[PDB]
Amino acid sequence: EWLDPVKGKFARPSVKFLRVATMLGFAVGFGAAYARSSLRFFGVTENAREYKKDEA
Amino acid sequence: HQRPELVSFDDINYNDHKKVREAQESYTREQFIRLEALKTVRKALEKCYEESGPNHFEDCKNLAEQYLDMLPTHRLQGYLGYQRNDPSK
Amino acid sequence: MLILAIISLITFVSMSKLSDNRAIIRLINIYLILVLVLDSFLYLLFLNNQTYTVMGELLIFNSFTFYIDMLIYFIMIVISSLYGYNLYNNNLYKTLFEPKKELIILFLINILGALLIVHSNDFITLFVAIELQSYSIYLITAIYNSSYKASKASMLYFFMGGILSILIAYSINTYYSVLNSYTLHSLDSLIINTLDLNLILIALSLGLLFKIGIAPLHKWLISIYENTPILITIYISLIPKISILSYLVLSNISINSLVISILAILTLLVGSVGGLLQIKIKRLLAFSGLTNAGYMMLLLLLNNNEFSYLYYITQYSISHLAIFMIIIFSIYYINYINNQYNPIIYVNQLKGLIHDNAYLVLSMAIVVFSFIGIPPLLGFFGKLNILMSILNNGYYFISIVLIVASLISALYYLYLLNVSIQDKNNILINSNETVSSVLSYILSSLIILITFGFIYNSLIIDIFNVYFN
Amino acid sequence: LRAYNEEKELALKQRLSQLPPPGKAFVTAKEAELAELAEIAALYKTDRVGILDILLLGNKHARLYRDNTALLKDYYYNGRRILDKIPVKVTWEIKREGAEKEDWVNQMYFLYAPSLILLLIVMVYKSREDITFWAKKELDQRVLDKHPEINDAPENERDALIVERIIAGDYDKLASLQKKAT
Amino acid sequence: FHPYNTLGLATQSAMVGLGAGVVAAAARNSLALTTFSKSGGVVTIFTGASIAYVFTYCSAANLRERKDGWNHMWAGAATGAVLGARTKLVPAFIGWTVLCGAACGLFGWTGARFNADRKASLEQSPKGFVQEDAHQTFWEVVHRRPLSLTVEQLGEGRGINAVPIATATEAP
Amino acid sequence: ILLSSLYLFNRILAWQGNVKHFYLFASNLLLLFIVVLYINFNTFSNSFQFNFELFNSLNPFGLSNSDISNGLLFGIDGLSLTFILLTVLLIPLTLLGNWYNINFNSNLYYTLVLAIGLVILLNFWALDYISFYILFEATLPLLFILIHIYGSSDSERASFYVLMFTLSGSLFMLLSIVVISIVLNTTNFINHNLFVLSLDLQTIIWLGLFIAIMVKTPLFPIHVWLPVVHSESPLAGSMILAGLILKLALYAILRLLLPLLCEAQILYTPMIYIISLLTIILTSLATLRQIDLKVIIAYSSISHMGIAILGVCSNTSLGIYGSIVLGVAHGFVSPALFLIVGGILYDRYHIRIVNYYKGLTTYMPQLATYIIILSFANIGTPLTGNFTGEFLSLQGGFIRNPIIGGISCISVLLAAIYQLKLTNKLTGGISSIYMHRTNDVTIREKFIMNILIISTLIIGICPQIMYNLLYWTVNNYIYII
Amino acid sequence: TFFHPKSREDILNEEAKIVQALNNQRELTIKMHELKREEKDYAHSYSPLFSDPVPQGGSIGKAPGSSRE
Numbered sequence A: 001e002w003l004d005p006v007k008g009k010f011a012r013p014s015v016k017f018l019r020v021a022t023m024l025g026f027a028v029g030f031g032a033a034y035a036r037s038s039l040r041f042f043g044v045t046e047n048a049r050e051y052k053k054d055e056a
Numbered sequence B: 001h002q003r004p005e006l007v008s009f010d011d012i013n014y015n016d017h018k019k020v021r022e023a024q025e026s027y028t029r030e031q032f033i034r035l036e037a038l039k040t041v042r043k044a045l046e047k048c049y050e051e052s053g054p055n056h057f058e059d060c061k062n063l064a065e066q067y068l069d070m071l072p073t074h075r076l077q078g079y080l081g082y083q084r085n086d087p088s089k
Numbered sequence C: 001m002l003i004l005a006i007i008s009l010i011t012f013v014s015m016s017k018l019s020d021n022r023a024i025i026r027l028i029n030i031y032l033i034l035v036l037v038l039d040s041f042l043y044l045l046f047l048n049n050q051t052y053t054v055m056g057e058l059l060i061f062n063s064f065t066f067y068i069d070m071l072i073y074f075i076m077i078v079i080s081s082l083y084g085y086n087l088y089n090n091n092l093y094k095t096l097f098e099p100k101k102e103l104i105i106l107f108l109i110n111i112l113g114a115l116l117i118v119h120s121n122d123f124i125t126l127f128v129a130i131e132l133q134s135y136s137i138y139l140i141t142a143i144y145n146s147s148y149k150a151s152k153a154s155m156l157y158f159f160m161g162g163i164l165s166i167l168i169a170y171s172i173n174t175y176y177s178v179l180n181s182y183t184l185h186s187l188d189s190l191i192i193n194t195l196d197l198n199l200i201l202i203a204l205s206l207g208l209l210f211k212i213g214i215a216p217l218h219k220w221l222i223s224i225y226e227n228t229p230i231l232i233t234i235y236i237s238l239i240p241k242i243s244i245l246s247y248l249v250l251s252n253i254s255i256n257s258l259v260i261s262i263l264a265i266l267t268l269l270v271g272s273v274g275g276l277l278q279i280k281i282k283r284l285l286a287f288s289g290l291t292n293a294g295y296m297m298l299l300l301l302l303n304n305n306e307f308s309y310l311y312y313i314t315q316y317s318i319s320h321l322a323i324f325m326i327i328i329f330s331i332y333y334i335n336y337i338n339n340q341y342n343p344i345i346y347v348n349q350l351k352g353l354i355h356d357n358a359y360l361v362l363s364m365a366i367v368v369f370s371f372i373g374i375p376p377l378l379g380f381f382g383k384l385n386i387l388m389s390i391l392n393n394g395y396y397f398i399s400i401v402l403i404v405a406s407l408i409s410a411l412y413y414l415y416l417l418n419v420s421i422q423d424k425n426n427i428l429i430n431s432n433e434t435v436s437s438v439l440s441y442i443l444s445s446l447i448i449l450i451t452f453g454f455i456y457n458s459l460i461i462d463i464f465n466v467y468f469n
Numbered sequence D: 001l002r003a004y005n006e007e008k009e010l011a012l013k014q015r016l017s018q019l020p021p022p023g024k025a026f027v028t029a030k031e032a033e034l035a036e037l038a039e040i041a042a043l044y045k046t047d048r049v050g051i052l053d054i055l056l057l058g059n060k061h062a063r064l065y066r067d068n069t070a071l072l073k074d075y076y077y078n079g080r081r082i083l084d085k086i087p088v089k090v091t092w093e094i095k096r097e098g099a100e101k102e103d104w105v106n107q108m109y110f111l112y113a114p115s116l117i118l119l120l121i122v123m124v125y126k127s128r129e130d131i132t133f134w135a136k137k138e139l140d141q142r143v144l145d146k147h148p149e150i151n152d153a154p155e156n157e158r159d160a161l162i163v164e165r166i167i168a169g170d171y172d173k174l175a176s177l178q179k180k181a182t
Numbered sequence E: 001f002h003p004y005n006t007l008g009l010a011t012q013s014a015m016v017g018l019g020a021g022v023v024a025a026a027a028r029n030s031l032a033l034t035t036f037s038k039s040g041g042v043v044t045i046f047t048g049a050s051i052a053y054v055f056t057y058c059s060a061a062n063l064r065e066r067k068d069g070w071n072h073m074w075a076g077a078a079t080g081a082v083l084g085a086r087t088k089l090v091p092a093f094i095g096w097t098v099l100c101g102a103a104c105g106l107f108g109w110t111g112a113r114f115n116a117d118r119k120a121s122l123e124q125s126p127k128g129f130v131q132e133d134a135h136q137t138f139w140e141v142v143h144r145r146p147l148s149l150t151v152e153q154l155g156e157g158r159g160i161n162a163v164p165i166a167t168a169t170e171a172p
Numbered sequence F: 001i002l003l004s005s006l007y008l009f010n011r012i013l014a015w016q017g018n019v020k021h022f023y024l025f026a027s028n029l030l031l032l033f034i035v036v037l038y039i040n041f042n043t044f045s046n047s048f049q050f051n052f053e054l055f056n057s058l059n060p061f062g063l064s065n066s067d068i069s070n071g072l073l074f075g076i077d078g079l080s081l082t083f084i085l086l087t088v089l090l091i092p093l094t095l096l097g098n099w100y101n102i103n104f105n106s107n108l109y110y111t112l113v114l115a116i117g118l119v120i121l122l123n124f125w126a127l128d129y130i131s132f133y134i135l136f137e138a139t140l141p142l143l144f145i146l147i148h149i150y151g152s153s154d155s156e157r158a159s160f161y162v163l164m165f166t167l168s169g170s171l172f173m174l175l176s177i178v179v180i181s182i183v184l185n186t187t188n189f190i191n192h193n194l195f196v197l198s199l200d201l202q203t204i205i206w207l208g209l210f211i212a213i214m215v216k217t218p219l220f221p222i223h224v225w226l227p228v229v230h231s232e233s234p235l236a237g238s239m240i241l242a243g244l245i246l247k248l249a250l251y252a253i254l255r256l257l258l259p260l261l262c263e264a265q266i267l268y269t270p271m272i273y274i275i276s277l278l279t280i281i282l283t284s285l286a287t288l289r290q291i292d293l294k295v296i297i298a299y300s301s302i303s304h305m306g307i308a309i310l311g312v313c314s315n316t317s318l319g320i321y322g323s324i325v326l327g328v329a330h331g332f333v334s335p336a337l338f339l340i341v342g343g344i345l346y347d348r349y350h351i352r353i354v355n356y357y358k359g360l361t362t363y364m365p366q367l368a369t370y371i372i373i374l375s376f377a378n379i380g381t382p383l384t385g386n387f388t389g390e391f392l393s394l395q396g397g398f399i400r401n402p403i404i405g406g407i408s409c410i411s412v413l414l415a416a417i418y419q420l421k422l423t424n425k426l427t428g429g430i431s432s433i434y435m436h437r438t439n440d441v442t443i444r445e446k447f448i449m450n451i452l453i454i455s456t457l458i459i460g461i462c463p464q465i466m467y468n469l470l471y472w473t474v475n476n477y478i479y480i481i
Numbered sequence G: 001t002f003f004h005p006k007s008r009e010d011i012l013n014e015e016a017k018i019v020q021a022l023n024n025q026r027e028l029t030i031k032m033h034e035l036k037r038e039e040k041d042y043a044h045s046y047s048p049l050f051s052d053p054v055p056q057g058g059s060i061g062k063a064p065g066s067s068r069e
């Protein structure tokens, strides 16, 4: 909105859109984090800590 | 005065570029030496002719025949013909 | 992420007012950007060309499909920006470019259909994804129902797509009847030697290829591209081409096909020759798209076409987006708006643009010379890789024809630049108006990619050698 | 070298403003206005800023100076062309003999011409390490190496002796390089 | 080389061309008994092109006892002659003849195929540097070729000799 | 440095407003730099010396010292150095010849001119097929734009010709380059004579390469684009095109074709001689019936290039040396004639029809002297480099094929005919009624023409001064068993 | 005195190093071309987990004797 205002004049996005924004952002973040952890499980990223915890 | 060491295409492995460049340069330099021999012959012939005048034929027969003989063989011929062909086979 | 976006967006667009369209589209633009950047690291799965079959052998995941997927997201981001942001803040442009209420949901669903086409490992999944994309793209054609041409276009598109879908379903079912299977993975060298599947597989390939408009069935698609709103044409001319071509490349069911050879030749000739006498901008661009689709069709005749195809499709996507965006920007300097769906229509309407905006014409020159294939722009390397592939596989006559077709198409590529660097009597004196920062930055990014991509060629091939070998 | 002075430009601008456009500024061909055109045009060759200010200052001064110089250029050259008079000395004199320097001459004459001179010198002196001289020396050394007794002969007899030996024998090594031939 | 049966192959080509012209006429009708009245002579176009191309190709191939692009060049010349007779102008007739002949000669030179001959292609062929003393095949490369091969292919003279000059002119 | 120099450029632009002083200074610095390089160039070695690599994967934005070379290669030997020196000599004169006649979008014009010059200069540094091709095509967009915006009345058709004909040839060149790439998996010029392709494959690759050479040189029968593109080009475009871009063709033969396809070249040489004799005789004759000044000067270049080709494919050291010397002399002389016809006469009278011009000696004696000198230089007067080039080229051609070379000796006569027929009408007679008196040649025009005249005279009296750079080259490419 | 070229031996050494890097690239190039045409394992090319190509069909009316290796 700062870069290119929707209606010429800058106005902070409404609370509905910001609430939306938080909801979807959390979804993307959780997807990314789940992917990182699973990739550790497959042995694609570094997984020493996870390996030990699994063995125990 | 530089006297780089002579290299031949027959001995070398063509995968070492330094040796291949040396072979190309050596072949060229030998051709140029042969040219110098031809020019020395020709200069001797010129001096012979100029001093012998009317009897230059008898005086300079040997030089004239030799110059005419070395003309077709002592020019440049370039290395591509011999590096790209192996005369044995 | 894509399914979650579709679901949420349906809920919101239901509960939002017509004035919130652009804000919603900005929201999704940023969401897709966030997904592209945060989830990119999943490339690491594909190290050593590791292939994964997923969903009970319905979907296939390898480096190739991951790349096509990222490319499709990048395209969707760029295309959604054109709707989510105003070029100018005047009344004229509010009338010219307003997003429909449901347009974004249709865009996301068509993207989902395209991704499912790419990943399809089984014919049932292929057919369902084809129908999903076909239906969504019918509706995108038809959503601007105030246009007579857009409605006529959507109906013609419905009928031609329906017939081609029936040809595809027939091919799938004949393959089932002969092999009692729905997967190409069941095919092997022994099976291809033993049985004559050529007719069935070529019918399937032709049914898919006529949907992106290869000759001699081009004209209906060029007419549709001409008659749709310009911001719709920027989308519907690109995504189906990518999905169908990528599926065919990945499947490799027409290797050394004589019929595909003849049809690729014909497509090159018709795309090059037929675009010469054009006077409308979008018909010129559609014949451009036909010729480039021919260049990509050639890659279906050979194995190990992954690098050449990926490079070509990426550079073509960038060049296509950029040329459409340049035509869009040049709208602000025309003195006659033809109508509210297609503001500029004739090539001659760009006449003298260099006197109004010199750097817009610079960008136009760069993209055009990429299309012609002038090094070191991306277009040159795309054509170079394609020639490398087809000459390695002994397609000599097709290479000669490709040369000739690039030459011929250079004429109507340079037609644009020619009229653009001519002189106009009424030259902009001044203006307070600023083009939107975001779209100008995006157009500039595309231009800089086309110009200076070649510096990364060797790095790209090094990466490729470890993810696709 | 610093010579800018924003006080002077903000004055020069309206001193220009009074005058007609330089295209129409002399089409009469009274002498008072032509005199002021003479002095203002003379300002063109009175260089008014050096390097320390073009490097340091802001771009508003830049644009203003650029416009000023453009108009000064026009007045100077339009008068000089439609009057056959130079704008120096300050009312329009005819003294065209000398005091004329074009802008290209400094760069060309003081850099390009010395560069071509240098190229010629370098070529002449690089021509000395030619293969003909090298091969004459090498042939002489080959003769002296095989046959070192002509190293005892006096200077004037030497060269004739080397020539004799060259004529008689094939001192080259080419066939030696062609080992697979035999 | 064993002969093409010119008569038979030309007859089958006549049949194929007649059928193709019939199909084109039916289409032409549908897109616009009148079908042949308003045909534009397309049946004749197909029939004449077919007979000309096939007859000239087989004729030339049989006469020269070779199979290569030149036969296609002749056949394209004949086909262009047929197609350019329709203009009823000598320059256009000559232009059709020569240019169609050139295009088809190019086609026959590349292999007279639209798809590829896979077994002969580079991807399916021995490539790279050859081994010890093997004969050169089309796609392979060496560091040195045998001088006898040079003398036979290129021919004697113009600096091509059986023996290097310096070796041959060495004194003893 | 680059950051600081960019700052300097920006400030100069903001204050002065016309980039052209900065470009002139820059080009002069480039000339000085190349001369420094020549100083430090070892001539007793047939190896490329100032090597560097770009866009290598380990360092995409810098130079590569890696053990794997996947970028673009650059470096010079004597043959490249000669043409590079010619290029850096010509560029500042190209900038200077349009110092006053461009009064609109002048910054863009000078940018295009300098960019084209730099592209050609870099092209001469290229050491592998791909980079050579890249920089070989990179000029076409710049030439197209330049000719279209700053050209004469018929400039649109000119721009389309200059783009289309050169693309047409370059794409067949691209076929040959692709075949070489996939067959050898290497592209470099350093060791490409080490690979001995099968004779049939050589014969096939040679076709694409030589089609490119036919369009670019040009040679008969595909030369018809050059006279147009010249006549409607602005002066800088014409000078660059005549003086450098044509020599790119000759350099292309020597660098790309001869070392790799030796045996196929031996097979095809008589066809080359047919085409060169055709271009010489037929274009020289066609020059007699032209009515445009710039068109006639353009037609002269094609014939001189025909003699150059006859020299360069002669398989003799003398022929190759003659081709190079003729290329350099042509690069000196032809820009001067183009300067005359398209910068002095055209900028004074804005017309190129020959009928208007007559008797220029009376009002402009200096211009008449320049015309006489340049024309006798163009037709090959001894003590001019043009004569040395034509003579040595003809020697090589006569040795390679006595009949064809002997017939080609008619070029001396034919060149004299068209050139002197032009200068006869231009210099003498009574001053034309159609045109009025204008100034004589100015200090700038005289400076440029003096540079070119002294260069051609210097290499014409002592052509040996080039030998130190070229004595390896005259043996590097001849194929004698 | 002003001519300071590099030594001939140094020029030869540097060009030989460049050519060696070029030949290394040619060999890597041919290598990758060959490796791409070799055939991968079923796990690497189709499915790492569940790496058995042999199907098991439906399980309702599992008939003794329907299994065939």
Ligand SMILES: CCCCCCCCCCC(CCCCCCCCCC)(CO[C@H]1O[C@@H](CO)[C@H](O[C@@H]2O[C@@H](CO)[C@H](O)[C@@H](O)[C@@H]2O)[C@@H](O)[C@@H]1O)CO[C@H]1O[C@@H](CO)[C@H](O[C@@H]2O[C@@H](CO)[C@H](O)[C@@H](O)[C@@H]2O)[C@@H](O)[C@H]1O
Pocket: C395, C396, C397, C399, C400, E067, E068, E069, E070, E108, E109, E110, E111, E112, E113, E117, E120, E121, E125, E136, E137, E138, E139, F172, F175, F179, F200, F201, F204, F207, F208
């Ligand atoms: C810049 C101008 C472009 C125009 C010219 C391009 C045309 C290329 C023609 C050359 C070429 C491809 C070369 C491509 C090289 C790169 C491509 C260049 C760029 C592509 C744009 C096509 O050769 C075709 O020539 C046609 C005749 O003209 C034939 O027509 C047909 O003839 C009849 C069918 O038998 C029919 O009746 C009918 O079907 C047609 O009549 C074709 O069959 C034939 O394939 C030759 O390829 C082939 O050559 C042979 C022997 O040479 C090679 O095998 C060799 O076997 C031994 C001897 O056999 C040797 O001992 C051995 O050593 C070597 O292994 C092959 O490996 C293969 O390589």
Ligand SMILES: CCCCC/C=C/C/C=C\CCCCCCCC(=O)O[C@H](COC(=O)CCCCCCCCCCCCCCC)COP(=O)([O-])OCC[N+](C)(C)C
Pocket: C036, C037, C040, C041, C043, C063, C066, C067, C070, C071, C074, C306, C307, C310, C311, C312, C314, C315, C378, C449, C452, C453, C454, C456, C460, C461, C463, C464, C467
């Ligand atoms: C911080 C995360 C941001 C990443 C967002 C990526 C968005 C993609 C959007 C559009 C595609 C645009 C260009 C893609 C670049 C190919 C990457 C690659 O290397 O291609 C290879 C495969 O080569 C190929 O087949 C050929 C590709 C054809 C490219 C044609 C254009 C060449 C010129 C582009 C120059 C790059 C600009 C840099 C300017 C400083 C796949 O690499 P990969 O599968 O291992 O994934 C990369 C690792 N990644 C996920 C973290 C990013």
Ligand SMILES: CCCCCCCCCCCCCCCCCC(=O)OC[C@H](COP(=O)(O)OCCN)OC(=O)CCCCCCCCCCCCCCCCC
Pocket: C375, C376, F050, F051, F052, F054, F063, F115, F118, F119, F121, F122, F125, F134, F135, F138
């Ligand atoms: C758009 C067309 C397509 C573009 C493709 C290619 C674009 C390239 C962009 C231009 C960049 C090349 C010029 C700069 C590279 C050379 C820099 C350098 O440092 O030279 C390396 C070489 C070895 O140096 P080094 O090993 O470090 O040892 C130093 C010992 N004291 O040191 C040397 O031996 C000196 C080498 C001198 C090189 C002369 C180059 C001539 C022209 C220079 C500018 C050209 C810019 C072209 C712009 C238009 C685009 C072509």
